[PDB]
C-alpha cells in the first residue's frame, strides 16, 4: 500500500545512513594518516 511504500522509503534512508557514516569516518581517519606520512 502507500503506507508500505513509505515504510520502504524509510528503510532505504536508514540503510543509506548506516552505509555512508562509517565509510566517511574511515576515509577521514586514514586521510589523516596520509597527511602525517
Amino acid at each position: 500500500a502507500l503506507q508500505h511504500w513509505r515504510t520502504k522509503i524509510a528503510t532505504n534512508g536508514r540503510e543509506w545512513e548506516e552505509r555512508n557514516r562509517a565509510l566517511r569516518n574511515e576515509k577521514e581517519i586514514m586521510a589523516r594518516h596520509y597527511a602525517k606520512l
Binding site: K8, I9, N12, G13, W16, R19, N20, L23, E26
Partner: peptide, 20 residues
C-alpha cells in the same frame, strides 16, 4: 522517488568505495 533514491544510494556508496 524510489528509483532516484536507489540510484543516489548506489552512486554515493560506489564513490565512497573508489575513493577508499
Amino acid at each position: 522517488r524510489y528509483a532516484e533514491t536507489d540510484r543516489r544510494y548506489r552512486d554515493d556508496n560506489m564513490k565512497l568505495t573508489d575513493e577508499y
